[PDB]
Design a protein around this ligand. Structure first.
Ligand SMILES: *[C@@H]1O[C@H](CO)[C@@H](O)[C@H](O)[C@H]1NC(C)=O
Ligand SMILES: *[C@@H]1O[C@H](CO)[C@@H](O)[C@H](O)[C@H]1NC(C)=O
Lengths: 41, 148, 37, 97
């Protein structure tokens, strides 16, 4: 948001996005070699 | 022809060919990897040098320490980023050739012998058209069978 | 008769970058950069 | 800073810009390196189930080459429960031919 911040704050960075994957590659009778079990929730 | 591939021998001849799908994906990966290392570095105009009087020794020392500090940080990071990335590059390549080995083993299934040296031997005669199929994801398992 | 081993997929459009890949769609992701005030 | 402290103001600015570049660079690579590993982690885990299961089923199934197994012996829901856990009883089942 801004580098001149007063308080107990997160580190300021010049990046636009920092996104961690937590999940699987989303690749939507056949097993994983195909990929895509949308029916398994 | 490429980084990973096939070698074959059959009634019609022998030779080498690259697995273009596997090589191109690995290639693009390495290219993106190199670019991540280089493109994420921030280059700005800088002059660096400062002048101090003889009555500003503590300020000159503060400036020197700040500059030496950042140099040690960037040198250390450069050294480990290169070593960590090289460890992964080499594991990446070993993984990719093994992945072809199993990608192929799983389509050939029971119609071949595993020879234990990174090759397969066909029970049914397999010609250049068969070779083309095996070298792609199109081997037709049902059309071939074990002799005994 | 048959048992298969596989994995989850959904309708998510969250994307991440990795060292080797760019714009990889993932089933779940977490944004760790605060953008608003 | 005063107008006669330009070198000190510049020292302060450089120190702050320096740390910002360090933290930004580290944030960018930590995220990319961690995401590379997260996705490999997940691929490894699904493959590990495939072999965990293949190794208990042993010779009583066919590998179909598409991430599935086909049983030679009839396998019902109680068998399914066993296979889906680490309890498949190999000795009770056999190949037909
Ligand atoms: C995606 O799937 C979820 C869960 O079934 C559903 O609630 C949501 O409406 C779907 N569509 C979109 C655009 O999120
Ligand atoms: C990733 O997606 C963004 C947003 O659409 C786009 O600007 C960028 O060029 C894409 N990068 C690649 C490598 O596809």
């Amino acid at each position: 948001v801004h580098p001149l911040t007063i308080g107990e704050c997160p580190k300021y960075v010049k990046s636009e996005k920092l996104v961690l994957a937590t999940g699987l590659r989303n690749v939507p009778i056949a097993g994983f070699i195909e990929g895509g079990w949308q029916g398994m929730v | 022809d490429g980084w990973y591939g096939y070698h074959h021998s059959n009634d019609q001849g022998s030779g080498y060919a690259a697995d273009k799908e596997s090589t191109q994906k690995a290639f693009d990966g390495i290219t993106n990897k190199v670019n991540s290392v280089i493109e994420k570095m921030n280059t700005q105009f800088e002059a660096v040098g400062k002048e101090f009087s003889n009555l500003e020794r503590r300020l000159e020392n503060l400036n020197k320490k700040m500059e030496d500090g950042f140099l040690d940080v960037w040198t250390y990071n450069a050294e480990l980023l290169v070593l960590m990335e090289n460890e992964r590059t080499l594991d990446f390549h070993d993984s990719n050739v093994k992945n072809l080995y199993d990608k192929v083993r799983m389509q050939l299934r029971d119609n071949v012998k595993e020879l234990g040296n990174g090759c397969f031997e066909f029970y049914h005669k397999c010609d250049d058209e068969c070779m083309n199929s095996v070298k792609n994801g199109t081997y037709d398992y049902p059309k071939y069978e074990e002799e005994s | 008769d048959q048992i298969c081993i596989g994995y989850h997929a959904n309708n998510s459009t969250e994307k991440v970058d990795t060292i080797l890949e760019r714009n990889v769609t993932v089933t779940h992701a977490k944004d760790i950069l605060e953008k608003t005030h």
